[PDB]
Design a protein around this ligand. Structure first.
Ligand SMILES: CCCCCCCCCCCCCCCCCC(=O)OC[C@H](CO[C@@H]1O[C@H](CO[C@H]2O[C@H](CO)[C@H](O)[C@H](O)[C@H]2O)[C@H](O)[C@H](O)[C@H]1O)OC(=O)CCCCCCCCCCCCCCCCC
Ligand SMILES: CCCCCCCCCCCCCCCCCC(=O)OC[C@H](CO[C@@H]1O[C@H](CO[C@H]2O[C@H](CO)[C@H](O)[C@H](O)[C@H]2O)[C@H](O)[C@H](O)[C@H]1O)OC(=O)CCCCCCCCCCCCCCCCC
Ligand code: CLA
Ligand code: CLA
Ligand code: CLA
Ligand SMILES: CCCCCCCCCCCCCCCCCC(=O)OC[C@H](CO[C@@H]1O[C@H](CO)[C@H](O)[C@H](O)[C@H]1O)OC(=O)CCCCCCCCCCCCCCCCC
Ligand SMILES: CCCCCCCCCCCCCCCCCC(=O)OC[C@H](CO[C@@H]1O[C@H](CO)[C@H](O)[C@H](O)[C@H]1O)OC(=O)CCCCCCCCCCCCCCCCC
Ligand SMILES: CCCCCCCCCCCCCCCC(=O)OC[C@H](COP(=O)(O)OC[C@@H](O)CO)OC(=O)CCCCCCCCCCCCCCC
Ligand SMILES: CCCCCCCCCCCCCCCC(=O)OC[C@H](COP(=O)(O)OC[C@@H](O)CO)OC(=O)CCCCCCCCCCCCCCC
Ligand SMILES: CC1=C(/C=C/C(C)=C/C=C/C(C)=C/C=C/C=C(C)/C=C/C=C(C)/C=C/C2=C(C)CCCC2(C)C)C(C)(C)CCC1
Ligand SMILES: CC1=C(/C=C/C(C)=C/C=C/C(C)=C/C=C/C=C(C)/C=C/C=C(C)/C=C/C2=C(C)CCCC2(C)C)C(C)(C)CCC1
Ligand code: OEX
Ligand SMILES: [Fe+2]
Lengths: 37, 341, 334, 451, 52, 136, 35
């Protein structure tokens, strides 16, 4: 796994590759809040 | 005025969902076919009929869940809840496979009630009834598969179960045992389904590419008010396009849109005629001139005789687990294997 | 004035009977050679070693076939992926034995269909049309290149390519089922929804136009003669067919816009066949469909069967019987 | 709000980034933000691939795709494909993660506070799409970087540590490329081969001297052609053939990126040199030959003459002869007779598989390799169970080759569709009829009779 | 000899003279109109309508 | 329904029977699929189909291999089927565990549970274990 | 067989050269808009 000074953050790193999908959904959420205009 | 007129005026009232006279046959029977399927794929097992698992309680996902056909010992019983098999008990009715006939029968009276819905709305709006006649296509596939196919066979057991992978075995059961792809009625049905998908992909892409300029915006979806009398695409241009690309082309919008009705629906009627001929086991199994020759000449091989050896594998390997009622105990040494497989 | 300008003016003329164009410079020589070799190889062609085991499979009409069983046989397992033209064959008899004309037809087909597609673009440019009919034709070009080109690449041989016939098609579909489990793969699922949906919205749109036609004929003559060609009046009450489907399901599920309606007819099949043709492509490289065999167990651990286990026993029957002599080792790696 | 609704532009919300064609600051901030996402994924994926690393299983059984690119560079890899350290993989995934927070800030600065057009304030960076001197300069600046980026592979493979050669004598190990191949008859020998079987157009580079010697010529071309397009201007024939607009340049790239998309998806299926089988698992062709070699060893121990062992079809059960004359393995594996692998090439000769060397010299590391590559063949499923399509659910393996050859191949068709959409519109936006046919002037009506 | 790594499948020397005389025989046709034109005349369009 | 009579497996060459605790049958499956199951999936052997993990085939080996103590014996020292010579150089083992990186971290209880899985699986599935594709 | 082979490379790069020098022949300007 990660080096010993970094084994603490092993849950947070598991979420990290998902985060680029969340930018695709952030566009539509932003288009909803702007009212699609 | 009378009592019939008040009821006639109430059902045909403009409301959220149009009820009409036909809604008394549709809305009770369609609600119970759909709810009988959602219940049967969630809770009711197939452990006693088929010897499978076909529920969400039993770990199956959306794909491997089904409402399954009853046992072969039931025969063609209607399996009424009050009947001689179930005798009023709900729990023993579900284990015999009573929900499957509950779905199929109340579903068959949903498709009756939905096609009557299309005659009733067309008479009130005042249009020609071609939706109700094109919907007769899908009626001829439900009836001649979910109803007329197990009636000609041994029981309801040989019918398609209402589940995603349970249709998929019915596709594989019909090749090994019936040679369904060789049947010219499927061949005229594939020509209508792939032909019907062809026509909407062309008519979709030719209308959308001969549009007129009706606005300054780059979006062309905005430039159409529904009540306008000017046509929205150049028919003369689209004819001139396909007359030079493909060589021949429609010059008639009335003939075009009728031809988009004829091609998908006829593929459901011609394929429905053949599956009635497989209830009687009148299959197009072999070309005897190919079979008499391959017997006398042990060198003559076609692709066609290659498909029979693929069907011996379907007829032998799955039929042990397919039909647990018949108790096929095959030895290892009768099952046709190939070399080193 | 020049000879080239008087040739470019003719080859890009829309005043020809059939538009030739610059893609027709390599559409017409390709597809006429794929045609003229197909008619000869379907009618009169000797048997072909397909399995590479020197067991020649007859596929033509003169060797005792019909329309259904006759087929242009794919090339040998001995050749495999190698390019095998006529001049690299040392005789035509050695060419026709080893599956010659399958590569001549297919390679001149995929060039001619990818040029027929660009030709649909070109005439749309010279006629003033918006251009994208050729994007809708990308969906059968994706599917033709999937079973003739991409699937022989990832499996490493043209012998696994699709036989040019009718019974050869069903030899292709069943063997593809046992080795790849296409029915459980979600891209065949997304294109069965593409053509069941496609034939739905075809017959659903074609009925609502034909339902709402305007009176322009008598009851003696044909319905179709109420459309004069090139007229500017609309030939059906579109408000009528909107109020019908607005009551048949409910109000808000109906397209009042005929442009957005005629776009959804082009979206649904074409997206369904793009996705499907990238199902054969990802299953050309042995990334198969789902496999739920022995997935449901009791607490004791005994395997409880599902419908996928019954589907598996149909796949095991085709797997142990396809190419019944070509195998020598326990696993069909090819 | 002006510029950000359909009343001002004419584009709907779903085709909303098409509003960025004729603004330059918003467009620059968009390209540097998506570049911030490409970096950010690769940093965050490698940290995800490090935290799930186990030294017990091999590198390909654990289902990784990015820490096997760095092992081809040679970081943390030992002899024979054994990853040792996994502290340098942590270091790379942080630099490609911190840097995306800077490229992230450029995407949020240049697209939310930057000027809409750079041509007003910044005359070096400002441009126009119709200009042809500036666009070849933008092409020229960004080609000299692709020249320099190709020499970083060459500097690293000759000076800074070396790269992983799987053909390295004595076993696969990090090897300095001492003498790369600089012969244009050999290097451009690949680029003009047949793409079919046996030749295998650019996939078939089979040693690291042609790889590292080849990336030299790429750096030579991309710098001279980078300087060529900075100085010059497009010729007479090049100005007549193209469309000089904004979307037309985008549909030029989408055609070429699809070429690179298919080719990287076909490297990963066949090539075992840039993609070592010790790291990515055995190829499609390699696992077909490892089966026939394993049962060759198995029945040779039973005292069976494997050369004269007549097969059931009449061919060779074990050794047969290829259609060019070479001694190969028999079965359905006769199609993959071009399989050149570092564990079978010890048994080659001029003729092929040397029968004297099979009868006498089979080394037990080859038996440990062919049995490893039989059981980890690239045959999988989407729920990640291995084996054939009818295998039961016990193993958890899909080869990383089958993920790369089915996803970059998946994209490379849709980017070919992007060449078709974006060039159909750009050629018709240049001509004026992308909005539809004019009702007053229809071009078909002013033509000949139809026939 | 199929799987030889030879440029464009040019096995014999005679096939080159076929390739060179194919591209050039149409190139010389093309230069009869689009050749011998001014290589120094520009435009600020997206598309040029200069001459024949 | 994992009764302790069903979890009771034979432990020595004489024939004593001990029971497997429920963590042994669970780690016994995870370790077997991760380590051994690449070739010994479901009891068959991919690279040598003659020598399987059948309870018939384990019994006919020249040292009897049905026991837990006999299977962990095989893992630390794999002889052939007739037991004359060693094939530790090609089968993964503990003795030859420098070449195989997969077996450098295995304790005594870990091999005790893997051999527990090989022995307790024919008692769960009687004919599926090592029956080939006929009994899938 | 090396006489047929000569005939094919004539026919291929005849039509390929008509394709290549077709779009170099000021092909964007051949539209119904202007010229
Ligand atoms: C068009 C639009 C339609 C709109 C959709 C409407 C949907 C409504 C749903 C229809 C309900 C039909 C199901 C009725 C149950 C069924 O059928 O039940 C079947 C029973 C017949 O029962 C079967 O009868 C068989 C005959 O047995 C007899 O023969 C045996 C050997 O001789 C033994 O002797 C046995 O003892 C003796 O009874 C076997 O016994 C079977 O086990 C037993 O199930 O008939 C019956 O109820 C009635 C059968 C007579 C009516 C025939 C019409 C219906 C059948 C059409 C299909 C004919 C087949 C053609 C195939 C194509
Ligand atoms: C074009 C678009 C129109 C479509 C029309 C198609 C007809 C065009 C005319 C035919 C051209 C066909 C392309 C052939 C691609 C192919 O066989 O490619 C295979 C080669 C891989 O070559 C393999 O290369 C291997 C090289 O390996 C050797 O070398 C390696 C060195 O490490 C290893 O050692 C290995 O073990 C050793 O054997 C072997 O030589 C194989 O025999 C050889 O086949 O890939 C390569 O050329 C690189 C990849 C080329 C891109 C392939 C794209 C496929 C196109 C699909 C498009 C679908 C969409 C259609 C839309 C229209
Ligand atoms: C790759 C993804 C991507 C990117 C980089 C952009 C970028 C952009 N889009 Mg866009 N868009 C996208 C996808 C994307 N789009 C998709 C998928 C759709 C379809 C729904 C749209 C639809 C769309 C429309 C309809 C419009 C744009 C517009 C714009 C531009 C200006 C936005 C603006 O000023 O409003 C202000 C923006 C906001 C208030 C959003 C705030 C959200 C913040 C920035 C998120 C930051 C989170 C991040 C983790 C923080 C990091 C900080 C750093 C310090 C670490 C901008 C360049 C507009 C345009 O054309 O401008 C002229 C416009 O009209 N987009
Ligand atoms: C390709 C990316 C790109 C481009 C073309 C621009 C272009 C521009 N930026 Mg911008 N910017 C970018 C990325 C980019 N930026 C990023 C990533 C950030 C976040 C750090 C910023 C943050 C930023 C701010 C905060 C400001 C600008 C400003 C400007 C404008 C003037 C810059 C200047 O003074 O030039 C001359 C500048 C220099 C000569 C300094 C260069 C120093 C760098 C470190 C050299 C780069 C090293 C090397 C080439 C990169 C290698 C890494 C590579 C492999 C990725 C100009 C239009 C300014 C502006 O518009 O004014 C309002 C401004 O205030 N930018
Ligand atoms: C990212 C890569 C890239 C891109 C997009 C471009 C883009 C462009 N280049 Mg460029 N170029 C690049 C890299 C790139 N270049 C590199 C790395 C080099 C160095 C080798 C060159 C060398 C170069 C030259 C020498 C020329 C261009 C030209 C062009 C323009 C388009 C012509 C074209 O594509 O015809 C595609 C055509 C072919 C693939 C085949 C052409 C066959 C030639 C014409 C036969 C004549 C022989 C000739 C002397 C070359 C000998 C090689 C061989 C063919 C015999 C366009 C602006 C042309 C231009 O307008 O100059 C400004 C031009 O004349 N480029
Ligand atoms: C307001 C009114 C709303 C109206 C509701 C109308 C009712 C119609 C809804 C129909 C839903 C039918 C789908 C059933 C799926 C299901 O529940 O799976 C639920 C199952 C249950 O999940 C299974 O649970 C089992 C428990 O033992 C096991 O754990 C299995 O592993 C696990 O998969 O989930 C799946 O199979 C996972 C995938 C789900 C995929 C569903 C989408 C598939 C596409 C169908 C789309 C239907 C469109 C409906 C549109 C409405
Ligand atoms: C995106 C989709 C994928 C795109 C394809 C990807 C590129 C594939 C790689 C192409 C290889 C190119 C190398 C040179 C060609 C090659 O060597 O082939 C030459 C090969 C080699 O030919 C054979 O070689 C053998 C030697 O081993 C033997 O000598 C044989 O006799 C000889 O025939 O022959 C062919 O493949 C002929 C191809 C004919 C196709 C021409 C049609 C192209 C028309 C397109 C229009 C032109 C516009 C594009 C140009 C700009
Ligand atoms: C997974 C779900 C599938 C995709 C989800 C959304 C559907 C596509 C919606 C946008 C379509 C784009 C759009 O709506 O264009 C609609 C287009 C006409 O649009 P207009 O010219 O009015 O405007 C579109 C642009 O010009 C910008 O306005 O119609 C076509 O030309 C149809 C002919 C091609 C017919 C085949 C089209 C298939 C392409 C779809 C692939 C798109 C993937 C990219 C999505 C942006
Ligand atoms: C290299 C490419 C050059 C183009 C290749 C040419 C091939 C084109 C095929 C010609 C279609 C001829 C059928 C006549 C049909 C005929 O003449 O119809 C003529 C009809 C014109 O209708 P109008 O609008 O003129 O009719 C108005 C009223 O008068 C209705 O009666 O055009 C169509 O509707 C055809 C569209 C569907 C086209 C159907 C094609 C089905 C494919 C062919 C199936 C047979 C293949 C069998 C092979 C064994
Ligand atoms: C059977 C029966 C019955 C009953 C009936 C009923 C009443 C039922 C109902 C039922 C129902 C009626 C059901 C329902 C169900 C539902 C469900 C369960 C759904 C689900 C859903 C889902 C899961 C989906 C998903 C999604 C979402 C959410 C969003 C996105 C998209 C998607 C599609 C993915 C009775 C009593 C008569 C008796 C006899 C028998
Ligand atoms: C690294 C490396 C290497 C190298 C590489 C190289 C050296 C490359 C080259 C590359 C190249 C050398 C490429 C080329 C390409 C080309 C192309 C692809 C082209 C295209 C073209 C076009 C696209 C055109 C078009 C057109 C036409 C046809 C007509 C008119 C119009 C136009 C102009 C548009 C090697 C192999 C050693 C190995 C591995 C490593
Ligand atoms: O060639 Mn036609 O089928 Ca594709 O898997 Mn392997 O290879 Mn053969 O066996 Mn199964
Ligand atoms: Fe329509």
């Amino acid at each position: 796994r990660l080096p010993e000074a970094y084994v603490v953050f092993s849950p947070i790193v598991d979420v990290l590759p998902i985060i680029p999908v969340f930018f695709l959904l952030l566009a539509f959420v932003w288009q909803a809040a702007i009212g699609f205009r | 005025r009378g009592l019939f007129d008040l009821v006639d005026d109430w059902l045909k009232k403009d409301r959220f969902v149009f009820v009409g006279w036909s809604g008394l046959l549709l809305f009770p029977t369609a609600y119970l076919a759909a709810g009988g399927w959602m219940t049967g794929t969630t809770f009711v097992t197939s452990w006693y009929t088929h010897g499978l698992a076909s529920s969400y309680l039993e770990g199956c996902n959306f794909l491997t869940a089904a409402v399954s056909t009853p046992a072969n010992s039931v025969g063609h019983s209607l399996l009424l809840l009050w009947g001689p098999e179930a005798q009023g008990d709900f729990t023993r009715w579900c284990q015999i496979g009573g929900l499957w006939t509950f779905v199929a029968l109340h579903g068959a009276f949903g498709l009756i009630g939905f096609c009557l819905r299309q005659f009733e709305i067309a008479r009130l709006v005042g249009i020609r009834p071609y939706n109700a006649i094109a919907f007769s296509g899908p009626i001829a596939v439900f009836v001649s598969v979910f109803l007329l196919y197990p009636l000609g066979q041994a029981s309801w057991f040989f019918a398609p179960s209402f589940g995603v992978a349970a249709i998929f075995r019915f596709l594989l059961f019909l090749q090994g045992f019936h040679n369904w792809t060789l049947n010219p009625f499927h061949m005229m049905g594939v020509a209508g389904i792939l032909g019907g998908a062809l026509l909407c992909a062309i008519h979709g892409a030719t209308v959308e590419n001969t549009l007129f300029e009706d606005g300054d915006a780059a979006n062309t979806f905005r430039a159409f008010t529904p009540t306008q009398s000017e046509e929205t695409y150049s028919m003369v241009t689209a004819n001139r396009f396909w007359s030079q690309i493909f060589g021949v082309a429609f010059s008639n919008k009335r003939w075009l849109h009728f031809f988009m009705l004829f091609v998908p629906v006829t593929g459901l009627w011609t394929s429905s005629i053949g599956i009635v001929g497989l209830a009687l086991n009148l299959r197009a199994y072999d070309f005897v001139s190919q079979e008499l020759r391959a017997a006398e000449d042990p060198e003559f091989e076609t692709f066609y005789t290659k498909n029979h050896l693929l069907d011996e594998g379907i007829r032998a390997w799955m039929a042990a687990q397919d039909q647990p009622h018949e108790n096929f105990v095959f030895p290892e040494e009768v099952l046709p294997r190939g070399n080193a497989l | 004035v020049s000879l080239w300008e008087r040739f470019c003016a003719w080859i890009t003329s829309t005043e020809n009977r059939l538009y030739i164009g610059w893609f027709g410079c390599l559409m017409f020589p390709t597809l006429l050679t794929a045609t003229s070799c197909f008619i000869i190889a379907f009618i009169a062609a000797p048997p072909v070693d397909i399995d590479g085991i020197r067991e020649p499979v007859a596929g033509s009409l003169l060797y005792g076939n019909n329309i259904i069983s006759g087929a242009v046989v794919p090339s040998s397992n001995a050749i495999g992926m190698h390019f095998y033209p006529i001049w690299e064959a040392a005789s035509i008899d050695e060419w026709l034995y080893n599956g010659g004309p399958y590569q001549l037809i297919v390679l001149h087909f995929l060039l001619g269909v990818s040029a027929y597609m660009g030709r649909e673009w070109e005439l749309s440019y010279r006629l003033g049309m918006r251009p994208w009919i050729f994007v809708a034709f990308s969906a059968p070009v994706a599917a033709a290149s999937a079973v003739f080109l991409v699937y022989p690449i990832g499996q490493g041989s043209f012998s696994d390519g699709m036989p040019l016939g009718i019974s050869g098609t069903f030899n292709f579909m069943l063997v593809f089922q046992a080795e790849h489990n296409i029915l459980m793969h979600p891209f065949h699922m997304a294109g069965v929804a593409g053509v069941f949906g496609g034939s739905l919205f075809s017959a659903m749109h074609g009925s609502l136009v034909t339902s709402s036609l305007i009176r322009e004929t008598t009851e003696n003559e044909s319905t179709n003669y109420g459309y004069k060609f090139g007229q500017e009046e609309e030939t059906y009450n579109i408000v009528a067919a909107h109020g019908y489907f607005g009551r048949l399901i409910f109000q808000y599920a109906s397209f009042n816009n005929s442009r957005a309606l005629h776009f959804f007819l082009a979206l649904w099949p074409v997206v369904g066949i793009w996705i499907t043709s990238m199902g054969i492509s990802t299953m050309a490289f042995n990334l198969n469909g789902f496999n739920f065999n022995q997935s449901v167990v009791d607490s004791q651990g005994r395997v409880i069967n599902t419908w996928a286990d019954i589907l598996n026993r149909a796949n095991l029957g085709i797997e142990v019987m396809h190419e019944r002599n070509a195998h020598n080792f326990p696993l069909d790696l090819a | 709000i002006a510029g950000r609704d359909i009343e001002s532009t004419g584009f709907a919300w779903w085709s909303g980034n098409a509003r960025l064609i004729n603004v330059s600051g918003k467009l620059l901030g968009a390209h540097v933000a998506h570049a911030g996402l490409m970096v950010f994924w690769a940093g965050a994926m490698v940290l995800f691939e490090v935290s799930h690393f186990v030294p017990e299983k091999p590198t390909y059984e654990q289902g990784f795709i990015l820490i096997q690119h760095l092992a081809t560079l040679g970081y943390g890899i030992g002899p024979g494909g054994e990853i040792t350290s996994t502290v340098p993989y942590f270091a790379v995934g942080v630099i490609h993660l911190i840097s995306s927070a800077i490229l992230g800030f450029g995407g949020i600065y240049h697209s939310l506070l930057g000027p809409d057009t750079l041509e007003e304030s910044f005359p070096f960076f400002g441009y126009d799409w119709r200009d042809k001197n500036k666009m070849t300069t933008i092409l020229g600046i960004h080609l000299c970087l692709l020249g320099l980026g190709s020499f970083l592979l060459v500097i690293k493979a000759m000076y800074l540590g070396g790269v992983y050669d799987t053909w390295a004598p004595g076993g696969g190990d990090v090897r300095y490329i001492t003498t790369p191949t600089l012969n244009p008859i050999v290097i451009f020998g690949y680029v003009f081969r047949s793409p079919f079987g046996g030749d295998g157009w650019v996939v078939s580079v089979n040693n690291m001297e042609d790889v590292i010697g080849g990336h030299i010529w790429v750096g030579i071309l991309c710098i001279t052609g980078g300087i060529w397009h900075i100085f010059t201007k497009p010729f007479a024939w090049a100005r007549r053939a193209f469309v000089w607009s904004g979307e037309a340049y985008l549909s030029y790239s989408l055609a070429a990126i699809s070429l690179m998309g298919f080719t990287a998806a076909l490297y990963s299926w066949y090539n075992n040199t840039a993609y070592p089988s010790e790291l990515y698992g055995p190829t499609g062709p390699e696992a077909s030959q490892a089966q026939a070699f394993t049962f060759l060893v198995r029945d040779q121990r039973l005292g069976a003459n494997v050369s004269s062992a007549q097969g059931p079809t009449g061919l060779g059960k074990y050794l047969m002869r290829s259609p060019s004359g070479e001694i190969i393995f028999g079965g359905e594996t006769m199609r993959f007779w071009d399989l050149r692998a570092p564990w079978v090439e010890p048994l080659r000769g001029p003729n092929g598989l040397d029968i004297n060397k099979i009868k006498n010299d089979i080394q037990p590391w080859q038996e440990r390799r062919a049995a490893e590559y039989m059981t980890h063949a690239p045959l999988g499923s989407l729920n990640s169970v291995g084996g054939v399509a009818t295998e039961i659910n016990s193993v958890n393996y899909v080869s990383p080759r089958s993920w790369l050859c089915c996803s970059h191949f998946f994209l490379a068709f849709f980017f070919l569709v992007g060449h078709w959409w974006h060039s159909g519109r750009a050629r018709a936006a240049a001509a004026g009829f992308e909005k539809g046919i004019n009702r007053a002037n229809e071009p078909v009506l002013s033509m000949r009779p139809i026939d | 000899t199929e799987g030889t790594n030879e440029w464009f499948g040019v096995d014999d020397l005679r096939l080159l003279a076929v390739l060179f005389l194919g591209h050039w025989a149409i190139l010389s046709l093309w230069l009869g109109s689009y050749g011998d034109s001014n290589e120094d005349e520009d435009f600020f369009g997206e598309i040029d309508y200069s001459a024949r | 329904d994992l009764d302790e009579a069903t979890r009771t497996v034979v432990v020595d060459n004489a024939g004593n029977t001990t029971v497997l605790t429920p963590e042994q049958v669970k780690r016994g499956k995870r370790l077997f699929n991760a380590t051994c199951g690449a070739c010994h999936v479901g009891g068959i052997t991919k690279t040598n189909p003659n020598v399987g993990l059948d309870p018939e085939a384990l019994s006919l080996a020249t040292p009897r291999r049905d026991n837990i103590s006999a299977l962990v014996d095989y893992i630390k020292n794999p002889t052939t089927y007739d037991g004359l010579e060693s094939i530790a150089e090609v089968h993964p083992s503990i003795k030859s565990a420098d070449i195989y990186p997969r077996m450098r971290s295995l304790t005594d209880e870990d091999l005790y549970s893997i051999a527990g899985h090989i022995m307790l699986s024919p008692k769960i599935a009687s004919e599926k274990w090592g029956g080939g594709k006929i009994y899938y | 067989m090396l006489t047929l082979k000569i005939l094919v490379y004539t026919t291929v790069i005849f039509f390929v050269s008509l394709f290549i020098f077709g779009f170099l022949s000021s092909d964007p300007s051949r539209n119904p808009n202007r010229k």
